[PDB]
Amino acid sequence: SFVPFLEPFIPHENTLLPELPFVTLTYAQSLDSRIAAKKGERTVISHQETKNMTQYLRSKHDAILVGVKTVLADDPGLNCKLGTPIRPIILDPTFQLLSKIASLKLIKLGLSGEGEPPVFITRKGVVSPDLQANLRSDYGISIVEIADRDVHRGKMSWFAILKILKDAEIHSVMVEGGATIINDLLICRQNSVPLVASLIITVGPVYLGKDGVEVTPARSVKLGNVRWWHGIQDAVVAASLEL
Template sequence: MSLVPLPESLVPFLDPYLPKPINEKRPFVTLTYAQSLDSRIAAQSGVQTKLSHLETKTMTHYLRSKHDAILVGINTVLADDPKLNCRYDGGSGGQIKIRPIVLDPLHKWQYSESNLRKICDAGQGLAPYILVDESVKDVEQPVLLSQGGKVVKLPLLKNRANNWHMIFDKLYEMDIESVMVEGGACVINDLLGGCGPVDSVIVTVAPVFLGENGVQVSPKTGVSLTDVSWWTGIQDSVLCARL
């Protein structure tokens, strides 16, 4: 499915929040996701829920074109089987490729059976780097390795409070200078709650209530945003801010 044109007004609106050089040896981190009016990102746990309007879906791919990598947690991968590629080319007709990063401490995901594997087979994306705990055995995935992906072992289960700093430090060592974090709820709540660095927050708000059974974004402590800007489209509103 092709993307609708990117609304022209989104380009200057998003620009101040896009990756810039930072004076730290870590990637620039953008936290972005779509939510309902009652702060839910899915109708139920494990159920894929489409919230974004077509124009904000194009915005998501535009944002991906500005980052080196896109990071998601294992629950998002198992629920949505996402393609994790970039379909925005700015009218150039060229393929912009972004590196998927999948946080999968217990190694639950079978990449060889995924939509992402099919995308890579077709030359439309990059194979992922899969982050697993160092205790996990039998992590060889020949298809993944043949496509240029990697299984990266880290001590993820020992000191979870420090995981995000360790993860971003490792990605920086692997020449990834900007990361777009898209979910799911545990990942978002961790980063909103201060467990790791976040340089920009970009939230799409859809005009719908998903109800009390929905998967909620709600960090453990209160969070104040600064440098706040709003954009309103045909259906959705977009919040850009910093923590």
């Protein structure tokens, strides 16, 4: 079972950044470190055993965070199949996904009660106040705004984002991806301390090739407390980021 394997890595209170929730960074990769096949090819990386492990991990987190690309590519449910509630947080600076709200599965689940209503994290002044009110009434959506003070070289501050989630009583968040989010978080440090508490990676035994969606940080990154697991098809590494 992956259950004892994950036990030191699921959220706990041994945190060096108490202002922030417990952050788990997780994704499924090919051997050549792609997280999605090339345009028009069907992405198959993670097998059922690590889909199960992902659901188990969500059952230990208050929220799950993805970006727009993931939502567009996967139309994911972003709920937990074990039945525990988990709050979907969508990072969407210009609230692009407004145009898709009538179609998205995570909106459907939020309306039916099978899931929690999602949070969209946008720049300040993207969604006017009346629209916010109407989207909350019609879809249960919340809009969380990041002030320009928390936007640096065009990028919303992970520290500021994670603070808001903690302030709203989200004490653990599972960040499930987007190549840009993964690359940024792998190197994001607050005074030498990683924002990521646990790194949990599925490796699928397949190559997606040079036109797949690549994950690789801007510099080398060392891991600690490494442990491996493997099932019938997939392998999983769990680790912390080195100081």
